Amino acid sequence: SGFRKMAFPSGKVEGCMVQVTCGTTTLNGLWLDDVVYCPRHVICTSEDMLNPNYEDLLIRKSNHNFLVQAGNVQLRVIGHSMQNCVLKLKVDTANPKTPKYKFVRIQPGQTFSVLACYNGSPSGVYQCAMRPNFTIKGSFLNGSCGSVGFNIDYDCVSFCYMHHMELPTGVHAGTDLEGNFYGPFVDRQTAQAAGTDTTITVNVLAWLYAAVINGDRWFLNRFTTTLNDFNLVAMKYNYEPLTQDHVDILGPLSAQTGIAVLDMCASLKELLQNGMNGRTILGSALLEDEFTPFDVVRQCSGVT
Amino acid sequence: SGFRKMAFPSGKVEGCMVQVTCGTTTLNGLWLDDVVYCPRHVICTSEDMLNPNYEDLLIRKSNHNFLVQAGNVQLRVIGHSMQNCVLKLKVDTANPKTPKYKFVRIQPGQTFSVLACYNGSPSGVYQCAMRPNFTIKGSFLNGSCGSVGFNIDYDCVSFCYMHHMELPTGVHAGTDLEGNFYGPFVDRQTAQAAGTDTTITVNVLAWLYAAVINGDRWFLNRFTTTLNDFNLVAMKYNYEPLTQDHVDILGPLSAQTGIAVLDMCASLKELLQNGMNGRTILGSALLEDEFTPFDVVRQCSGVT
Ligand SMILES: *CC(=O)N1CCC(C(=O)Nc2ccc(OC)nc2)CC1
Ligand SMILES: *CC(=O)N1CCC(C(=O)Nc2ccc(OC)nc2)CC1
């Protein structure tokens, strides 16, 4: 028992981290097979970031200008190309530690682990979620760009995020491994404000199921609700609308606990309207939304 | 910017996890050099756990009864011994992936990462703290015994915990890598109640410094206090006493932010007496105590 914000074991991803330097900018790259993926803003000076024309800046760069270092050994760059907001640096050596991998573009509400890196070296691993406004709330200092987000299914790493920037509000924006930003963000140092950071309702319900499974049951009430009634309350509290797809996804947790999804919705409705009254759920004084129903099942079953 | 509950990259520890089976019990072992460390309760049946005499149970065991599997390959056991509550199984092969390592016994308030494992396979990594009552609040299902806690200093892994049991209250107890339990706990299925789980004051202050560094400043007040005055309030709220050693340890955070430690104590005193009033600090509605001053400096500076 016990329920923790858990990240995937990071070993498979640590074996892929490299340092990429272009001129005076050094960030992280992801080495899979004979390709190193990194943010295209590695070619920018701090001045260039104000209004960069990436195609024009890239013309002044040759393969030998991209310095790629894996550990303390240099990789030879034999090609470079820009795909959306990422650069793909072809190297002459396949990464011997390349795990089975996929590039996936996640939806808002989906969680992933981040291996925060500096100078191609891993510093830490933490779990986060793609927010409904397409930002993530990470922990990234200068030099962390190119750090990646991922999920693991047994031995296959699904890379879903690459870090590119911090908005002026301290929230983070990045791309999938095809270089397409999540949300409307651009790799330019300009006014980019995030939209409403709503709560991921289906994740909160999954976490309330985890709480029941782990013995924290005080919030369970004698009520039920409907999807439409619940959603009226969810709208009021800036919670995402709950759909029948979400109810279906919560089915196995409902089955395990014997608590109907709409009954759990009614408990959540009362928590929104009455508050926690100084009480906690799974050691938290607020409703946690960075556990998906899949994460709750995985952690409560012990998937390796 | 941003501040997350971050675990150490787990790769170095993943390379040490093995499966240990004795009869019908299978748990995890830690393979360093030619020795596999595991909880001695691997020799117990579910019945034996009620009142085990480990020396007597061990007499009926031979090297060939300990099945050690690293990945899908079997290790040959050439010796076994009991050191306190851990078994040391000498194998004929040194772990080729053994990192530089130390065995350390941590003090309450100290944090570490746990690589939760099942059948010798890593399932997840999370960060926790040795509570002042010598329990940890982990996430451990059956089969997770032998999972370890650790800290990393660049390339050296300091192992500090091995998981052994879950108390009837859902909290966890375990040993250092010398097999000595933290706290008064025993590897027996008997009435073992934990003492008061007090809050780690020095860690809360470190986390309030992290909050200021990251822009969350609403809780800063116009007051100061003394160590004695603060401690009167800390006692009332089940917070650990703050010592001059703790104030000294917080010195670099005080220097970086320009906020004197006793001023931060006065802010914490007001948060204890007035509550959060529905507000949050670093995305939390309660005062976080599982970040040490060293963790705050490390995360706020980017140590790899
Ligand atoms: C995430 C990352 O690694 N980045 C590269 C460095 C970059 C940065 O520091 N930019 C910057 C420099 C100087 C000034 O002056 C106003 N502003 C921003 C952030 C992204
Ligand atoms: C942490 C771990 O791996 N453990 C080994 C299994 C053990 C267990 O499941 N014990 C147990 C079995 C049957 C009964 O019946 C009442 N109680 C406890 C827990 C520790």
**Rounded Cα distance, A100 and B82, in Å:** 40
Check whether residue A290 and residue A141 sit in a common domain. Answer: no
Cβ–Cβ < 8 Å for A135, A194: yes
Residues 6+ apart with CB under 8 A from A105: A160, A176, A178, A180, A182
Residue A27: closest CA among A129, A148, A118, A135: A118
Could you tell me the sign of the dihedral formed by the alpha carbons of B289, B292, B298, B304, in that order?
Answer: negative
Judge whether B280 is closer than 8 Å to chain A, CB to CB: yes
Look at ligand 1, atom 14, and give the residue with the nearest C-alpha.
A46
> What stretch of H or E contains A57?
helix A54-59
DSSP SS3 for B304? coil
Check whether residue A1 and residue A114 sit in a common domain. Answer: yes
Cβ–Cβ < 8 Å for A264, A203: no
CA B164 / ligand 2 centre spacing (Å): 10
Q: Which two tokens stand for residue B214?
A: 């990251």
Residues in A closer than 8 angstroms to B128, CB to CB, are: 4
Check whether residue B153 and residue B7 sit in a common domain. Answer: yes
Cβ–Cβ < 8 Å for A39, A162: yes
Check whether residue B174 and residue B225 sit in a common domain. Answer: no
**Rounded Cα distance, B118 and B27, in Å:** 7
Cβ–Cβ < 8 Å for A5, A107: no
Residue B13 CB-density burial (10 A; 0-12 exposed, 13-18 middle, 19+ buried): buried
Q: What is the CA radius of gyration of chain A?
A: 21
Q: What are phi and psi of A231, to 5 degrees?
A: -65, -30
**Rounded Cα distance, A218 and A8, in Å:** 30
Question: Who among A1, A10, A14 is closest to B170 (CB)?
Answer: A1
To the nearest whole Å, the CA of B59 is away from the closest chain A CA by 32
The residues with which A126 forms a beta bridge, in sequence order, are A114
Q: Do A9 and B125 touch (CB under 8 A)?
A: yes
CB atoms within 10 A of CB A160: 25
Q: Which of A37, A68, A99 is the last residue of a domain?
A: A99
Buried b (16+ CB within 10 A) or exposed e, B289-300: bbbbbebbbbbb
For B213, the closest chain A residue by CA position comes to A170
**Rounded Cα distance, B270 and B264, in Å:** 10
**Rounded Cα distance, A208 and A210, in Å:** 5
From A43, A48, A142, the mutation candidate for ligand 1 (largest count of ligand atoms within 8 A of CB) is: A142
> What stretch of H or E contains A66?
strand A66-70
Check whether residue A142 and residue A223 sit in a common domain. Answer: no
Check whether residue A5 and residue A145 sit in a common domain. Answer: yes
Ligand with the closest atom to the CA of B120? 2
Check whether residue B85 and residue B154 sit in a common domain. Answer: no
**Rounded Cα distance, B15 and B4, in Å:** 25
**Rounded Cα distance, A273 and A271, in Å:** 6
**Rounded Cα distance, B98 and B116, in Å:** 18
Residue A114: closest CA among A170, A157, A73, A51: A157
Residues 6+ apart with CB under 8 A from A46: none
**Rounded Cα distance, A75 and A206, in Å:** 45
**Rounded Cα distance, B134 and B193, in Å:** 11
Judge whether A297 is closer than 8 Å to chain B, CB to CB: no
Question: Who among A124, A283, A303 is closest to B6 (CB)?
Answer: A124
**Rounded Cα distance, B86 and A94, in Å:** 42
CA B167 / ligand 2 centre spacing (Å): 11
Cβ–Cβ < 8 Å for A172, B4: no
How many residues make up chain A in this entry? 304
**Rounded Cα distance, B44 and B21, in Å:** 11
Taking CA atoms, A206 is separated from A221, A254, A290, in Å, by 17, 9, 10
Cβ–Cβ < 8 Å for A71, A126: no
Q: What are phi and psi of B26, to 5 degrees?
A: -125, 125
Could you tell me the sign of the dihedral formed by the alpha carbons of A178, A140, A49, A64, in that order?
Answer: negative
Cβ–Cβ < 8 Å for A189, A145: no
Q: What is the CA radius of gyration of chain B?
A: 21
Give the DSSP letter of residue A242. Answer: P
For β-strands A77-83 and A73-75, DSSP reports them as unpaired
Residues 6+ apart with CB under 8 A from A8: A113, A125, A150, A151, A152, B124, B125
| CB distance B201 to ligand 2 below 6 Å | no
Check whether residue A1 and residue A111 sit in a common domain. Answer: yes
CATH label of the domain that carries residue B270? 1.10.1840.10
Specify the residue for token string 């396979």: B121
Q: What are phi and psi of A143, to 5 degrees?
A: 100, -15
Judge whether B278 is closer than 8 Å to chain A, CB to CB: yes
Taking the CA of residue B232 as centre, how many other CA atoms within 13 Å lie in the half-sphere pointing to its CB? 5
Judge whether A69 is closer than 8 Å to chain B, CB to CB: no
Q: Which two tokens stand for residue A35?
A: 């390709």
Q: Which two tokens stand for residue A273?
A: 């309207």
Side chain identity, residue A235 = M
**Rounded Cα distance, A176 and A192, in Å:** 19
Q: Which two tokens stand for residue A132?
A: 């409904």
**Rounded Cα distance, B240 and B235, in Å:** 7
| Whether A300 is catalytic | no
Check whether residue B141 and residue B7 sit in a common domain. Answer: yes
Q: Which two tokens stand for residue B254?
A: 């005080």
For A168, the closest chain B residue by CA position comes to B1
Method used for this model? X-ray
**Rounded Cα distance, B140 and A299, in Å:** 9
Check whether residue B188 and residue B250 sit in a common domain. Answer: no
Specify the residue for token string 């933290």: B182
CB atoms within 10 A of CB A190: 11
**Rounded Cα distance, B121 and B138, in Å:** 17
CB atoms within 10 A of CB B274: 10
Cβ–Cβ < 8 Å for B34, B94: yes
**Rounded Cα distance, A71 and B124, in Å:** 25
Cβ–Cβ < 8 Å for A126, A149: no
| CB distance A19 to ligand 1 below 6 Å | no
To the nearest whole Å, the CA of A139 is away from the closest chain B CA by 4
Catalytic residues of B: 41, 145
For β-strands B66-70 and B17-22, DSSP reports them as antiparallel
DSSP SS3 for A11? helix
**Rounded Cα distance, A207 and A285, in Å:** 13
Question: Who among A1, A5, A278 is closest to B166 (CB)?
Answer: A1
Residue B158: closest CA among B104, B108, B116: B104
Cβ–Cβ < 8 Å for B197, B133: yes
CB atoms within 10 A of CB A252: 15
Residue B9: closest CA among A160, A11, A140: A11
CA dihedral A219, A222, A225, A231 (to 10 degrees): -20
| CB distance A301 to ligand 1 below 6 Å | no
Q: Which two tokens stand for residue A128?
A: 């986060």
**Rounded Cα distance, A118 and A21, in Å:** 12
Taking CA atoms, A85 is separated from A82, A236, B230, in Å, by 7, 37, 52
Residues 6+ apart with CB under 8 A from B12: B99, B152, B155, B157
The residues with which A118 forms a beta bridge, in sequence order, are A121
Check whether residue B8 and residue B48 sit in a common domain. Answer: no
**Rounded Cα distance, B240 and B138, in Å:** 21
Q: Which two tokens stand for residue B202?
A: 């020095």
**Rounded Cα distance, B267 and B219, in Å:** 6
Could you tell me the sign of the dihedral formed by the alpha carbons of B276, A233, A273, A297, in that order?
Answer: negative
Residues in A closer than 8 angstroms to B299, CB to CB, are: 124, 139
**Rounded Cα distance, B189 and A15, in Å:** 41
**Rounded Cα distance, B150 and B158, in Å:** 5
Q: Which two tokens stand for residue A225?
A: 């609700």
Residues in B closer than 8 angstroms to A7, CB to CB, are: 7, 124-126
The rounded Cα A215 to chain-centroid distance in angstroms is 29
Angle between helices A227-236 and A261-274 (to 10 degrees): 30
Q: Which of B58, B79, B99 is the last residue of a domain?
A: B99
- Cα angle vertex B152, ends B146, B156, to 5°? 95
Give the DSSP letter of residue B41. Answer: G
Residue A81 CB-density burial (10 A; 0-12 exposed, 13-18 middle, 19+ buried): exposed
Side chain identity, residue A12 = K
The residues with which B289 forms a beta bridge, in sequence order, are none
CATH label of the domain that carries residue B27? 2.40.10.10
Buried b (16+ CB within 10 A) or exposed e, A269-295: bbbbeeebeeeebbebbbbbbbbbbeb
DSSP SS3 for B158? strand
Q: Which two tokens stand for residue A216?
A: 């924290």
Q: Which two tokens stand for residue B43?
A: 């020799």
Ligand with the closest atom to the CA of B162? 2
**Rounded Cα distance, A198 and A289, in Å:** 10
The rounded Cα A255 to chain-centroid distance in angstroms is 29
Q: Which two tokens stand for residue A236?
A: 């009021």
**Rounded Cα distance, A112 and A295, in Å:** 10
Q: Which domain holds residue B163?
A: 1-14+100-197
Domain count, chain B: 3
Buried b (16+ CB within 10 A) or exposed e, A44-55: beeebeeebebe
Cβ–Cβ < 8 Å for B59, B75: no
Q: What are phi and psi of B239, to 5 degrees?
A: -100, 150
Cβ–Cβ < 8 Å for B94, B16: no
- Cα angle vertex B304, ends B299, A131, to 5°? 50
Judge whether B285 is closer than 8 Å to chain A, CB to CB: yes
Q: Do A118 and B302 touch (CB under 8 A)?
A: yes
| CB distance A144 to ligand 1 below 6 Å | yes
Q: Which of A197, A230, A254 is the last residue of a domain?
A: A197
Give the helix ranges, DSSP H, for B23-156.
Answer: 54-59
Judge whether B31 is closer than 8 Å to chain A, CB to CB: no
Judge whether B115 is closer than 8 Å to chain A, CB to CB: yes
Check whether residue B266 and residue B293 sit in a common domain. Answer: yes
